[PDB]
Amino acid sequence: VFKKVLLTGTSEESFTAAADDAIDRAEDTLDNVVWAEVVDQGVEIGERTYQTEVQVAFELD
Amino acid sequence: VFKKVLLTGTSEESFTAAADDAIDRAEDTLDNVVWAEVVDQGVEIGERTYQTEVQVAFELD
Amino acid sequence: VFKKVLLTGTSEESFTAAADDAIDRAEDTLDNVVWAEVVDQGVEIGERTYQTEVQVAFELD
Amino acid sequence: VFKKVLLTGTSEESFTAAADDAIDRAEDTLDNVVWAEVVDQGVEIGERTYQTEVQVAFELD
Amino acid sequence: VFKKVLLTGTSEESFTAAADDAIDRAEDTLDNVVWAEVVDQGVEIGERTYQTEVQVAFELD
Amino acid sequence: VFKKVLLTGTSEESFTAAADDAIDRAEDTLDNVVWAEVVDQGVEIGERTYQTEVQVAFELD
Amino acid sequence: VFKKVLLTGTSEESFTAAADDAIDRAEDTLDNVVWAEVVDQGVEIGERTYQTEVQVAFELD
Amino acid sequence: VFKKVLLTGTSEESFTAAADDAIDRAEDTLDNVVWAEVVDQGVEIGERTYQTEVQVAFELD
Amino acid sequence: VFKKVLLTGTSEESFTAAADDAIDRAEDTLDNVVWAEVVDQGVEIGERTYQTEVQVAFELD
Amino acid sequence: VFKKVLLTGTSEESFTAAADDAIDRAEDTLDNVVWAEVVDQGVEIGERTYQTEVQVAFELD
Amino acid sequence: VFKKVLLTGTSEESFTAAADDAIDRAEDTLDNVVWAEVVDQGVEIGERTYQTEVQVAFELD
Amino acid sequence: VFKKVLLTGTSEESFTAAADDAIDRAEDTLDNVVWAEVVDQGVEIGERTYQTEVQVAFELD
Ligand SMILES: [Cl-]
Ligand SMILES: [Cl-]
Ligand SMILES: [Cl-]
Ligand SMILES: [Cl-]
Ligand SMILES: [Mg+2]
Ligand SMILES: [Mg+2]
Ligand SMILES: [Mg+2]
Ligand SMILES: [Mg+2]
Ligand SMILES: [Mg+2]
Ligand SMILES: [Mg+2]
Ligand SMILES: [Mg+2]
Ligand SMILES: [Mg+2]
Ligand SMILES: [Mg+2]
Ligand SMILES: [Mg+2]
Ligand SMILES: [Mg+2]
Ligand SMILES: [Mg+2]
Ligand SMILES: [Mg+2]
Ligand SMILES: [Mg+2]
Ligand SMILES: [Mg+2]
Ligand SMILES: [Mg+2]
Ligand SMILES: [Mg+2]
Ligand SMILES: [Mg+2]
Ligand SMILES: [Mg+2]
Ligand SMILES: [Mg+2]
Ligand SMILES: [Mg+2]
Ligand SMILES: [Mg+2]
Ligand SMILES: [Mg+2]
Ligand SMILES: [Mg+2]
Ligand code: NA
Ligand code: NA
Ligand code: NA
Ligand code: NA
């Protein structure tokens, strides 16, 4: 069984980093993270901060 | 990092309330709720109860 | 078996009412209406009239 | 020919109001506004402020 | 209030089983599971293992 | 001309059956059913009953 | 209240005709047809026959 | 940089014309129109007038 | 088994022709072409050339 | 690099089989098939034959 | 009220830059740019130039 | 006529590279590659490898 969590990473360098950012939180706090699928991307402006929302996937048990 | 939870609120008054309803649960039980995005809305009939499913967003740490 | 009909309700008060409006037609004319799912919403302007298109669901037999 | 503008209204009462809000800006500043179609809805929390993003439509010439 | 979790079941018999598989995990670990909605389906090949990703829904409190 | 009806079949065995179920109602009550397209699938839990919503297509005249 | 029916027109000349084709059936058999929205288009080959599936809309009462 | 405008053309001959119609307005009033992408199509009935909504694209500066 | 290829036809007359255009290439080079489904349509401007992208379907063996 | 092919399998038993059916063609004729993702499902009626369209994925080189 | 404009940035380095590119045009010419949401990304080839289409958002008044 | 192929590139540096990766395979093996459109992006974890699935487009003849 996999499970997914919907996290948004933010970096002031790139979207790819913005992804890494969240994947790193999922990993700080869950074991067996298997993949992640990008569901959205945006830029905070209002430094400019890029965001990448990921469904992080992770094997149950 | 943000995180999201997929909750469905229900009110017998309106969709807006049906949203409030869930946002209030997310808040009962999580700190730093930042926003929420409506992903669906329906009406239970089978009183008539309106539903609004929200992705509730909330800042990690 | 359920069946669905694609109806658009209109109210000059709100979207929630605009939904009620149609759900009330489905009920005038069908027995066992079980639920309804919002598929769209708009505003006539050209009073301002709000619309909510619903797939109204109803149990066959 | 119609044209559309992508505006987000916000009210601290409801989504329907959040729609009205923007439709009122489109009207402050354009003639012949014909309709509007809801493309999204959210709630600012981080008072609670409801949003409704509309494609506002308006007849050219 | 309902809540949902995004789980992927896998069976080497069918998609329907692949669904059951996850619904059984949601139930091992949560009370009041009300329904589930299929959001995706795939086949691992690289025995052939069918997958069905479900949003499992479950009543809060 | 084809026409379509939006029906949901339910079986306690599988999604495929859940489809058959509705296609059988469309056929009980319409002549020339040509095809059907799956638009959704879910599981009632709250026995476990699988659902498959179909747009059933059928030739007019 | 509007209602919609999901019809597919076919012409061996064009998609636009393929639309007209169905809108003409909706009109043969319903009063107050208000508009129609194209939901799909295809070509039968297996003369070449173009199809346009429409949600035909029509005012109730 | 490109920019886009969301225009709806209408012709009483065809969808293709309904597209041309708007692309001609974009051109009346903007320089460097590069392409356009069809986002929707409908028929006014309530002569029969075909519509094609386009995102018209045009190079900035 | 069917298979599909993702081709874009272009004509300076219409979208329907733009479809024919590609369906004719699929046929130049494959046997048993069964149908085709329109996935997109656009206009080159930057004569005006209409495009229709098709998934062309064709029976394997 | 992966590559994908868009195939439709058909079985007169189930959707899962209808998937297997195509995955078996992809394998008859390509090496390293890694996975497959269901993009659609339908039933031929006009025996009843279930279909499952798959994007079959397969590692290049 | 927010408003949005649909711009496509292009860079020969990355998608993130391709985003920055447009966000910089929106800013050259509008005050209060609040955020931006990625709606598409592509690569011109026919140097290789990456594109990122953004809905740039900006507070009215 | 254009044609498209559905390829997934992977890089351990970024999504943009993950795109380049596949566009480079399409070019190794086809003449006249005109553009490419991003349809998905993910990260293998289970080094971290970023993926970008592209529809690579290429002019026939
Ligand atoms: Cl989710
Ligand atoms: Cl429908
Ligand atoms: Cl837009
Ligand atoms: Cl494809
Ligand atoms: Mg920096
Ligand atoms: Mg997002
Ligand atoms: Mg009340
Ligand atoms: Mg819902
Ligand atoms: Mg009033
Ligand atoms: Mg509507
Ligand atoms: Mg108040
Ligand atoms: Mg929005
Ligand atoms: Mg077995
Ligand atoms: Mg999945
Ligand atoms: Mg049983
Ligand atoms: Mg359903
Ligand atoms: Mg002819
Ligand atoms: Mg169709
Ligand atoms: Mg005429
Ligand atoms: Mg439209
Ligand atoms: Mg000409
Ligand atoms: Mg296209
Ligand atoms: Mg049998
Ligand atoms: Mg299909
Ligand atoms: Mg460089
Ligand atoms: Mg784009
Ligand atoms: Mg590295
Ligand atoms: Mg992918
Ligand atoms: Na989730
Ligand atoms: Na319908
Ligand atoms: Na716009
Ligand atoms: Na393909």
CA distance C44 to D23: 11
| Contact predicate I24/L59, CB 8 Å | no
Question: How many CB contacts within 8 angstroms connect chain A with chain B?
Answer: 23
Contacts of I51 (CB under 8 A, 6+ apart): I8, I9, I10, I15, I18, I40, I41, I42, I43, I44
User: How many angstroms is it from K46 CA to the middle of ligand 15?
Assistant: 57
CA distance B15 to D14: 9
What is the least distance, in Å, from the CA of B17 to any CA of chain C? 10
CA distance E54 to E56: 6
Chain breaks in chain K (C to N over 2.5 A) after: 46
Q: Is E47 annotated as a binding residue?
A: yes
State residue G28 phi and psi, 5-degree precision: -35, -45
Q: Which residues of L32-59 are buried (b: 16+ CB within 10 A; e: fewer)?
A: ebebbebeebbbebeebebbbbbbbbbe
Q: Neighbouring chains of J at 3+ CB pairs within 8 Å? A: E, F, I, L
Three-class HEC string of D1-61: CEEEEEEEEEECCCHHHHHHHHHHHHHHHCCCEEEEEEEEEEEECCCCEEEEEEEEEEECC
CA distance I7 to I56: 7
User: How many angstroms is it from A41 CA to the middle of ligand 6?
Assistant: 6
The radius of gyration computed from the CA coordinates of chain J, to the nearest angstrom, equals 12
| Four-point Cα dihedral J12, J14, J16, J21, nearest 10 | 0
> Closest ligand to D53 CA?
12
Chain breaks in chain A (C to N over 2.5 A) after: 46
Question: How many CB contacts within 8 angstroms connect chain A with chain E?
Answer: 23
| Contact predicate G23/G54, CB 8 Å | yes
| Contact predicate F47/F12, CB 8 Å | yes
Nearest to D24 by CA among D38, D42, D14, D10: D10
Q: Is the dihedral of CA L13, L18, L20, L21 positive or negative?
A: positive
Nearest to D9 by CA among D45, D46, D49, D59: D49
Contacts of E23 (CB under 8 A, 6+ apart): E9, E33, E36, E54, E56, F43, F45, F48
Contacts of G60 (CB under 8 A, 6+ apart): C7, C25, G1, G2, G3
Nearest to G52 by CA among G61, G60, G40: G40
Cβ-in-10-Å burial (0-12, 13-18, 19+) of G31 comes to exposed
Structure tokens belonging to residue I42: 């656009």
Structure tokens belonging to residue B44: 């239970």
State residue B36 phi and psi, 5-degree precision: -155, 145
User: Does I40 sit within 8 Å of H23, measured CB to CB?
Assistant: no
Query: What is residue K45's three-state secondary structure?
Result: coil
Chain breaks in chain G (C to N over 2.5 A) after: 46
The CB-side HSE value for I27 (13 A sphere, CA atoms) comes to 14
Q: Is D27 annotated as a binding residue?
A: no
> What's L30's DSSP letter?
-
Contacts of I26 (CB under 8 A, 6+ apart): I5, I7, I33, I36, I56, I58
Contacts of E33 (CB under 8 A, 6+ apart): E23, E26, E27, E56, E57, E58, F45, F46
Query: What is residue F57's three-state secondary structure?
Result: strand
CA distance L58 to C5: 43
User: Does H2 sit within 8 Å of K5, measured CB to CB?
Assistant: no
Nearest to K56 by CA among K13, K8, K18: K8
CA distance C3 to E27: 30
- Residue to test with chain F: of G8, G20, G28, G49, most F Cβ within 10 A: G8
Distances from the Cα of G41 to the Cαs of G49, G53, I40, in angstroms?
11, 6, 10
Helix H or strand E segment including L26: helix L15-29
Nearest to K45 by CA among K8, K12, K9, K17: K12
Question: Are β-strands H2-11 and E49-59 bridged in parallel, bridged antiparallel, or unpaired?
Answer: unpaired
Query: Bridge partners of D44?
Result: B35, D49
State residue H29 phi and psi, 5-degree precision: -115, 5
Q: Which residue of K has its CA nearest to D50?
A: K1
Query: What is residue F5's three-state secondary structure?
Result: strand
Contacts of J27 (CB under 8 A, 6+ apart): J33
State residue H6 phi and psi, 5-degree precision: -100, 90
Alpha helices, DSSP H, located in chain A: 15-29
Distances from the Cα of H14 to the Cαs of G15, G20, G53, H48, I54, in angstroms?
9, 10, 15, 10, 20
> What's E23's DSSP letter?
H
> What's L57's DSSP letter?
E
Q: How many whole angstroms from its chain centre is CA J55? A: 7
CA distance F49 to G8: 32
CA distance J12 to G24: 36
I16 → closest Cβ in G15, G40, G45: G15
Q: Is the dihedral of CA H16, H19, H25, H26 positive or negative?
A: negative
| Contact predicate F57/F37, CB 8 Å | yes
Q: What is the DSSP string of chain G?
A: -EEEEEEEEEESS-HHHHHHHHHHHHHHH-S-EEEEEEEEEEEE----EEEEEEEEEEE--
Q: Is D59 annotated as a binding residue?
A: no
F14-18: long-range contacts, CB 8 A cutoff, minimum separation 24: F14/E14, F14/E16, F14/F50, F14/J14, F15/E15, F15/E16, F15/E19, F15/F41, F15/F50, F15/F51, F15/F52, F15/J15, F16/E16, F16/F52, F16/J13, F16/J14, F16/J15, F16/J16, F16/J50, F17/F50, F18/F50, F18/F51, F18/F52
User: Does D44 sit within 8 Å of B32, measured CB to CB?
Assistant: no
Query: Bridge partners of A8?
Result: A53, B2
Q: Is H40 annotated as a binding residue?
A: yes
CA distance D22 to D25: 5
Domains held by chain D: number: 1
User: How many angstroms is it from K20 CA to the middle of ligand 5?
Assistant: 12
- Residue to test with chain L: of A28, A35, A55, A58, most L Cβ within 10 A: A35
Query: CB count, 10 Å around CB of H39?
Result: 14
Max Cα distance, chain E (Å): 41
Cβ-in-10-Å burial (0-12, 13-18, 19+) of G33 comes to buried
CA distance F2 to F61: 9
| Contact predicate B4/A6, CB 8 Å | yes
Angle at F40 between CA F38 and CA F41, to 5 degrees: 105
Cβ-in-10-Å burial (0-12, 13-18, 19+) of D29 comes to exposed
Task: State the residue for tokens 């969590």.
Answer: A5
| Contact predicate L18/L41, CB 8 Å | yes
CATH number for L9 = 3.30.1660.10
CA distance L21 to L33: 14
Structure tokens belonging to residue B34: 């930042």
Q: Is F37 annotated as a binding residue?
A: yes
CA distance F59 to D47: 55
Task: State the residue for tokens 């800013």.
Answer: K27
Query: CB count, 10 Å around CB of B12?
Result: 12
Query: CB count, 10 Å around CB of I32?
Result: 14
Query: What is residue E55's three-state secondary structure?
Result: strand
Distances from the Cα of J36 to the Cαs of G41, H20, K47, in angstroms?
26, 40, 34
- What is the domain extent for residue D34? 1-61
Q: Is the dihedral of CA G52, G55, G57, G60 positive or negative?
A: positive
**Resolution reached, in Å?**
2.8
CB contacts, 8 Å: G36 with chain H? 42-43, 45
